[PDB]
Design a protein around this ligand. Structure first.
Ligand SMILES: CC(C)C[C@H](NC(=O)[C@H](Cc1ccccc1)NC(=O)c1cnccn1)B(O)O
Ligand SMILES: CC(C)C[C@H](NC(=O)[C@H](Cc1ccccc1)NC(=O)c1cnccn1)B(O)O
Ligand SMILES: CC(C)C[C@H](NC(=O)[C@H](Cc1ccccc1)NC(=O)c1cnccn1)B(O)O
Ligand SMILES: CC(C)C[C@H](NC(=O)[C@H](Cc1ccccc1)NC(=O)c1cnccn1)B(O)O
Ligand SMILES: CC(C)C[C@H](NC(=O)[C@H](Cc1ccccc1)NC(=O)c1cnccn1)B(O)O
Ligand SMILES: CC(C)C[C@H](NC(=O)[C@H](Cc1ccccc1)NC(=O)c1cnccn1)B(O)O
Ligand SMILES: CC(C)C[C@H](NC(=O)[C@H](Cc1ccccc1)NC(=O)c1cnccn1)B(O)O
Ligand SMILES: CC(C)C[C@H](NC(=O)[C@H](Cc1ccccc1)NC(=O)c1cnccn1)B(O)O
Ligand SMILES: CC(C)C[C@H](NC(=O)[C@H](Cc1ccccc1)NC(=O)c1cnccn1)B(O)O
Lengths: 43, 178, 196, 192, 178, 192, 196, 178, 196, 189
């Protein structure tokens, strides 16, 4: 996700644990209810 | 060639050979030989020895027309095999002069062919296949003296004849036994 | 080559090729020649989609060059049998059997694309079928059975007389989509819907 | 192209979805490998339920005679009734398998073709005349057995099967119902 | 060869054979034979026996031009088969001297060919196919005495003729019955 | 044409549902690769339970002799009784495998044909006359071994097998019961 | 060789090409000759990507020698149909039918890499179509209809007169990327964007 | 052979045939026949009957050089087909003595060939293709009396001629109508 | 035979060949002949490796006989397009198009192992292109356009004049690794980094 | 047929995860790219563990040879070449290309060395053929200097030996210098 560039001849390719979002943790397997009950992220 | 030399010396004795399948090449040289021999003598018989597995109808109809239109009699000789067009041209000989050698075999059957192309083309081919098969059966009925319904039923698949069976059926007039 | 995508449906992480995705939206795809192996596929898909929902329309995309007559009438009968209405869309060509399957869709639901080609012609034997004249008399009465049945089929679906189909399918009658709409193979040329 | 659709883990084509609904599909020519497939499917569906009937779809140009009688005997062996539906064509062996279904349960689509003919040999079988008179007693065994098989199922005399299969007797669906190969020309169920 | 020897002896009797498909090889030797026989005698007829499944239009147009430009009459003879270019050259004979042997068959149909290449090439080929087919139908209308619309409609697919049907239609002038 | 129920789990086509029910299937010709397949299945089913009967289905045109005796030995080796069922045909080497079942357990469908014939060379084996003397003593050994194999299983004299397999002897199901190749002809089990 | 893993997850045998990665970013890839099976693939992907998002632009990569005309107009119509704008990018070549698909992109969105060529020419018959002269007059009226339809397609996408397309596609007209920009096949010769 | 015997007897009458494609074998025997006939009589015309689909340029340039360098006039005759190298050699005949038989067809088009090999080889082939095509168009412009720009535009694809159209265009000087 | 080893990944289990293990490390193999399907694969890899990190250098291992010119310029333009620097390493051979792709790496990053062959030659027509002389003068001006473009391409990557490329590529100018460094196709004869 | 055993995987997967690259097919561009992919994978997995290369190959193309040869010499790992049955032509050069001390051969393995050949006929002008013949002498000299630096023999001695097919046994290839030890059988009985 951090590093999700555009792919191919079209869109631009300029468009650790500290860049974490729940979009990453839903992809990990944490349900979005579990994540919002954990507002603070230490890394 | 030797084979052409023996055939040339038998052409001089008015003995011609239908020895292959009746395609247009063998038919045209037989038609040429009948036209050549009827030009030499219009009163001496042509001996047509037939060892043929049959062939094209229109090629054999060329031979059959050249046989009939020749002013001389065409004595035909079933020599080993007279199948399909070869039995036709055998039975197409001058009556009284159609011979089977005593171990020749005569195969009478309906015409084979092939349908191809569009449905309008095949309807024309089948219409012409009905014309060819009716005309081929009419002439085999005329040659053998059999009814045309007898020729239709018997030619439906391969019907084989010995020399003695072809004599009774009407393809030949004599069995040569010397 | 056919790239495969992933659908996050009620489940998610479901790998799907575009042809499974067409079939999931009840689109049967006739893009290959109508032979037995293709007709076997389409009839299986027509019966599956009738079973999944007999009320929703089955869409049939036709990019076929056409083919075998019994494979044609296998697909044809299954298109007519199922409770679902068949929406035939022509994509490129519908030639031979395919234009009959294109006309075989539900009235009102037969479409082509504006540059689609509809090629109707009489049945033909592929190559020489040989045999005795009694065999060929059967095979020629059979292709006249096939020719009459194709014209009877196109008479039901184009609204033309079967003798008019017979005069038109003497040669290759190539129709465009607007010419096949006026003929009655389709009844929608299906205007493009691009937003620009 | 033949798509699939994921059920529930499992990936099923429409042929699986047919087969789970007791529908065996004869869609290719009857050779050994297809007959082996059909017989395996006939025994699986009989084991799953020998009282729920098996449906056999026949879109086939026919084929080998021993592959025919392999399917035929297995169709007659299984406890389930066989519902044969003809789809487009049933030629040769396929028409014998079409007639081989349970009486009352033999169907054809309205534009299906039913082609019956005597057995043949593909190409020439060489051999001595003792070999050939055995191969010809065999093709006469195959011809008589096929005409007997069509006599059990069409309700006709085997001598009348013999006169009809002299050439390609090509039947429509209505002509095969009058003949006895099918029992029902399957009418369309379109809602419109 | 024997086959060449019989054809040479019938060339001496002014009897030539169109016995194959009309390709450029058979056409050029027939054109050579017509040029050779018209050089020998310009007043004795050439008998052209035709057992032909048809062939190339331009090859048969070479024969047809050599037949017309020969100062001697070309008696044509449908022998078994006068199809396509072979019916054309049959009907191209001198009027009064076009013969069908009584079991010959005459096949009149439109020209066959092939389109290939780019769309600009095929537009030229089709333009020339319309020129060839109009000219072939004009001459068959001139030969048979049929209207050109009659020839157009009848040659659209294969139209077969018996000898008696070809006599009525106009391809031949007599049916030989000796 | 075969419905595979695909799925990371077992695939389960109808041949798996034959093999789990201890039915080995021989429907292809008996070449090396098929014989290798059959022997792998005969050993696996012996190891799963050596007391339950292995069923062998035979729809084979026959094939090579060493591939025949590969299957034959493994059928005779395993502790499980082999139930041979003929489907359609058991020709050539496959008639020997059909007779190679356990006595009482050799079955055939009613319209299954059983073809017995002496071994033949596939094509022409070239060589010097000392090479061909070896190859002819070989096929005479193959012929004698096939006859004494059919002598063991049909209960006949090997000289009777020699006179009968001089040409192609095609037996029907009832004729193979009288001969000794199968033990029972399967009756149809249909409830109609 | 194409690097591609199979993740299983006990739900699938899930394949991951780089083409699957391109198709996820709405890049349809015409890299083979335009035949029926290619056209069938491309149209199925255009309709999937229209359904996934009809607003985002489909990108079509074209590295193709070009092929059949009805397969061409199959892809062409499905391009022109979908609500998504189509970004056509030429890779290496767009010849024959593939140059028509290259011009068939949305105006302003037709790209070519700088050393790509664009080969336009009139339709042909690969091989000889045999037949009677009535059959060939049908097949030649067809190849003229194919020629006129290709020219009027290239007329409405290049802004040229269709008669100018006649005189230019009389032979092979190979354009460069910059020559196809001046001609109107593409709108942008795509600049390199390397860091160094 | 019979076919060689008729051609030999027409070689005695100074009638030679371009009846095939113009490859090097047919060209060398025509060049040999023109050299043989000009050695016999340097004042009697050679009749070159042309039934040719065209062929190699350099083979036909061998014939054309042997035609021009022969001290006797080469009367050319379009017989059925004078296409490509065959129209060239037709139009290469002595002016006043170029004939079309009235149903011959004349096909004038630019040379066909093939490029192969490396880019430096193909640049040489194209340079030589421009030399051959300019020289072939210059001579067809010289033969027919047409402008070279007229020959360039007309030969760009296949341009077909009837006998009457080839007479107007300039390939032949007369249409034989006997 | 190629062993597809198994990596325990997030999604159930990932099964990967050695090519995908290296594709995760920005490593591309041009190891097949450069045809359309090869060029299609390499362009898909080069774009995917650009989108994952456009600043991490892509390594293109080249063991190729070379091939088609448009497939060449499809790979070439995509190598020049991507934001990531391309590290071309020659293995064994880079012949024809492959030597152009070897020279098409980022300057300073074009390697060849010491026994790698680098073969440059002018483009050739494989087989014989038939046709009228107007067709062939198009096909010959095209292969002169291909020859000039390849010499122009090898000019700005080897730092030579395109005329100097033209005299050299008249025949098969076959270079070793050290001869291709002096020529300018590679920048470094890549020394063996074996630790013994 | 190749029986597998999943999650313990076929036998080639099990050899590869134990760092055994397999060359049993002929050395062409396809097999070279496979081996060079595997050499670069096993270098990236651990560069300090030995890669073992099994050679049952009849040999093949020279540029496919020197592709594998260079990559074997390129990777940080030591290459352990074992000859299995045969190492003919190009594959005997790869057999000699292992790390010294780590070139094994099975006792009945054949090692066949010969000079490079052109398979078939390369047509062309004499200037094309003068290039192709200076190239096959480039390939011949490079193969002999490659076998010179790995067998310890003079390159002219390699040239006289590879005049014809020099078939070596396992023990003859040890005395020649292609392999370093003939691998003794270690069966417990
Ligand atoms: C007495 C009858 C059966 C004569 C038989 N003739 C045919 O069946 C021949 C066999 C043949 C020979 C050459 C080329 C093609 C076909 N059939 C024909 O010539 C034929 C077929 N269909 C229409 C018109 N003629 B014989 O050859 O079996
Ligand atoms: C016009 C419609 C009815 C179908 C067109 N042609 C046919 O009728 C097809 C053409 C075809 C295709 C594949 C194999 C053999 C024959 N006819 C048949 O399928 C067919 C099959 N058996 C006997 C007679 N006709 B289409 O395939 O061009
Ligand atoms: C008429 C029914 C019973 C079967 C039809 N086909 C056959 O007769 C088939 C065609 C065929 C195939 C291969 C080799 C020889 C012959 N007959 C046989 O299976 C067959 C096999 N061995 C001996 C004799 N006939 B039909 O086409 O399915
Ligand atoms: C004479 C006409 C009316 C009927 C048939 N003739 C043709 O159409 C012939 C058949 C043929 C023969 C040899 C080579 C190629 C084609 N067609 C031509 O020669 C032909 C075709 N297109 C343009 C110009 N000539 B016949 O040969 O069946
Ligand atoms: C008679 C029984 C034993 C087997 C029959 N044929 C043989 O004897 C087979 C021939 C055959 C036939 C079909 C496929 C493969 C091989 N004989 C052999 O395998 C064989 C092999 N090497 C030497 C001698 N015989 B059967 O396959 O027709
Ligand atoms: C110029 C565009 C329209 C397409 C070009 N060629 C065509 O027009 C193609 C060439 C082709 C390709 C594959 C199979 C048969 C024919 N034309 C056709 O598709 C075609 C198909 N049927 C009849 C007439 N033309 B391209 O493929 O060179
Ligand atoms: C009047 C002109 C068009 C003459 C034509 N000649 C050619 O195009 C012939 C066709 C041909 C014949 C034999 C072998 C190869 C090629 N072309 C040539 O001979 C040719 C081709 N390229 C360079 C030099 N000569 B004719 O044959 O179409
Ligand atoms: C020298 C470089 C630029 C290219 C070399 N190969 C070529 O020249 C290739 C070989 C080839 C392939 C197919 C048809 C004709 C020619 N040239 C082409 O790609 C090509 C393709 N179409 C027309 C003209 N040239 B090499 O082998 O990669
Ligand atoms: C002796 C060693 C170096 C290699 C041996 N084979 C070769 O020399 C191989 C055999 C071969 C294969 C394909 C085309 C031409 C030649 N030489 C080459 O790879 C080769 C390829 N192109 C040009 C020159 N040599 B051996 O048989 O593996």
């Amino acid at each position: 996700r951090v590093g999700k560039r555009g792919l191919g001849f079209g869109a631009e390719v300029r468009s650790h644990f500290a860049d974490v979002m729940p979009e990453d943790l839903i992809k990990f397997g944490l349900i979005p209810e579990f994540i919002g009950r954990l507002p603070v992220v230490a890394s | 060639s030797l084979t052409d030399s023996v055939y040339e010396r038998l052409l001089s004795e008015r003995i011609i050979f239908l020895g292959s399948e009746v395609n247009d090449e063998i038919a045209n040289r037989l038609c040429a030989q009948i036209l050549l021999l009827a030009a030499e003598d219009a009163s001496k018989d042509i001996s047509l020895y037939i060892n043929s597995p049959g062939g094209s109808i229109s090629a054999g109809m060329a031979i059959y027309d050249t046989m009939v239109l020749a002013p001389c009699d065409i004595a035909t000789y079933a020599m080993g095999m007279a199948a399909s067009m070869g039995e036709f041209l055998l039975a197409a000989g001058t009556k009284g002069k159609r011979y089977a050698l005593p171990h020749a075999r005569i195969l009478m059957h309906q015409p084979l062919g092939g349908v191809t192309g569009s449905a309008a083309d095949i309807a024309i081919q089948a219409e012409q296949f009905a014309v060819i098969k009716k005309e081929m059966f009419r002439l085999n009925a005329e040659f053998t003296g059999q009814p045309i319904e007898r020729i239709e039923a018997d030619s439906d698949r391969d019907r084989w004849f010995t020399a003695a069976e072809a004599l009774e059926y009407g393809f030949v007039d004599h069995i040569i036994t010397r | 080559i056919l790239p495969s995508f992933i659908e996050h449906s009620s489940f998610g992480v479901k790998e799907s090729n575009p042809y499974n995705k067409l079939f999931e939206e009840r689109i049967i795809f006739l893009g290959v020649q109508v032979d037995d192996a293709s007709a076997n596929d389409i009839m299986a898909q027509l019966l599956v989609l009738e079973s999944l929902d007999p009320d929703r329309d089955i869409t049939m995309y036709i990019n076929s060059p056409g083919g075998g007559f019994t494979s044609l009438m296998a697909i044809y009968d299954t298109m007519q049998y199922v409770r679902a209405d068949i929406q035939t869309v022509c994509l490129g060509q519908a030639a031979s059997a395919a234009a009959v399957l294109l006309a075989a869709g539900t009235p009102g639901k037969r479409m082509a694309l504006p540059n689609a080609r509809v090629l109707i012609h009489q049945p033909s034997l592929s190559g020489v079928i040989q045999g005795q004249f009694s065999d060929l008399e059967i095979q020629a009465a059979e292709i006249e059975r096939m020719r009459t049945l194709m014209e009877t089929t196109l008479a039901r679906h184009t609204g033309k007389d079967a003798g008019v189909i017979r005069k038109d399918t003497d040669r290759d009658k190539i129709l465009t989509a607007e010419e096949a709409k006026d003929y009655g193979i389709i009844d929608t040329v299906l205007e493009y819907r691009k937003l620009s």
